[PDB]
Structures are given as structure tokens and as C-alpha cells.
Design a protein around this ligand. Structure first.
Ligand code: HEM
Length: 188
């Protein structure tokens, strides 16, 4: 996992659960309690997993539920740290831009396995967005979507269409419906 995003998660964990839980979780995998993780680093996925399991044990919340809560709150953290990804956008543009963003942020790592987040319109007021990744981070993905809605103040209805592993990759497809129409038919 690129350090760019792991750094945001550590802050978000502090925001949600507090410094003791976070400091102890970091110390439990051999990190300095105050470690600041940089874009220059590649963090092992299994370490992130151990940290979250320790956060789980101390809070007494299921780890899926923690990823869900982190997903929702991390949008806030992202918009404070990298506002230019948010400014002058509405929800629909932000979400459709996300696949491209994750390729751009990992393209100079080789062996990079960004999550794929391809979205397409399926109706005047709806898109289908599909999470595809080896990392099975389904609750994070869903949480991020819920936090994006809340950050842009745009109500959405989200339907999980399908979730499972297709040939090695975890996949989760959702249909996201906006309150009003956001697309219109145009000459292709
Ligand atoms: C400005 C907003 C965002 C930035 C800068 C950002 C950046 C990143 C980066 C750099 C990674 C590490 C990927 C890797 O190492 O392969 C990551 C992981 C991830 N990103 Fe984002 N992200 C943003 C918002 C979102 C949104 C809105 C979604 C979903 C709709 C999303 C979905 C994910 C997921 C689910 C992961 C976990 C990795 C996985 O499942 O394979 N991100 N993000």
C-alpha cells in the first residue's frame, strides 16, 4: 500500500478512536507511535492488517466495521490534505475520476496493483461503479462512497449489485443513484 494513503489512515484512526488506541496499535507492530508515513514509502499490506486488527481488539469493534468507519471519515482527511482533488467538483465528477486518480498515483511503482474503480452512467440519474482489487477492501470502498456523499452534500442511494471473487480479484459492483439527473443523452 502506498504510504500516501496509509498516512491518511493513521490520522483518521486518531480522529475516530483516539491517540492511545492508535499509539499502542502502531507500537504493537514495531512502529514508532508517532511515525509519519510519506508518499516515498511502500507499506506492507499485512502490517496495515495487523494495525487494524489491534485497533479492532482495543475498541471492541469488528474490523469490517472499523474499515467502514475509516472509509467514511477518511474522505474528510483526504479533503484537508489534498483539497485540489475536491475543489470545484461535484460528487458525480469526483467518483468517475477516481479510477484515473488511483492509476496516476501508482504509475511509477512497478508491480503496482491499485484498486480499479471504473464507473459508467447507466441512467440519467445513476452510475454503476465497480471496485476491483486483490485486497478485498469492500467496507473501505463503501465507506468512502458514503463519506463522499456526505462531503459534497449530495444525497445518494447505493445498491450493492454483486460482490465476490472473479478469477483472483475481489469485485464489488454498486449502482449509485443521485437525487436529480446528472447525465443527458448526447451524440456519440
Ligand atoms: C482524493 C481522493 C483519494 C486519493 C488521493 C486516494 C489515494 C489512494 C492511494 C494512493 C491508494 C493506495 C493504492 C495502492 O497502493 O495500490 C488508495 C487505496 C484505495 N483507494 Fe483511494 N484515494 C482517494 C479516494 C478514494 C475513493 C473516493 C475511493 C472509492 C470510491 C477510493 C478507493 C480506494 C480503496 C478501496 C483503496 C484500498 C486499496 C485496495 O482496495 O486495493 N479512494 N487510495
Amino acid at each position: 500500500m502506498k504510504g500516501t494513503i496509509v498516512g491518511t489512515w493513521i490520522k483518521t484512526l486518531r480522529d475516530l478512536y483516539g491517540n492511545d488506541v492508535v499509539d499502542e496499535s502502531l507500537k504493537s507492530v514495531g512502529w514508532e507511535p508517532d511515525r509519519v508515513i510519506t508518499p516515498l514509502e511502500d507499506i506492507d499490506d499485512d502490517e496495515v492488517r495487523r494495525i487494524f486488527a489491534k485497533v479492532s481488539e482495543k475498541t471492541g469493534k469488528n474490523v469490517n466495521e472499523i474499515w467502514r468507519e475509516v472509509g467514511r471519515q477518511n474522505i474528510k482527511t483526504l479533503s484537508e490534505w489534498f483539497p485540489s482533488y475536491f475543489a470545484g467538483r461535484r460528487l458525480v465528477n469526483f467518483l468517475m475520476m477516481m479510477d484515473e486518480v488511483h492509476l496516476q498515483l501508482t504509475k511509477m511503482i512497478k508491480g503496482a496493483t491499485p484498486p480499479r474503480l471504473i464507473a459508467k452512467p447507466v441512467a440519467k440519474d445513476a452510475i454503476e461503479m465497480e471496485y476491483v482489487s486483490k485486497r478485498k477492501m469492500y467496507d473501505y470502498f463503501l465507506g468512502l462512497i458514503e463519506g463522499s456523499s456526505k462531503f459534497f452534500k449530495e444525497e445518494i442511494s447505493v445498491e450493492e449489485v454483486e460482490r465476490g471473487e472473479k478469477d483472483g480479484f475481489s469485485r464489488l459492483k454498486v449502482r449509485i443513484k443521485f437525487k436529480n439527473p446528472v447525465f443527458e443523452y448526447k451524440k456519440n
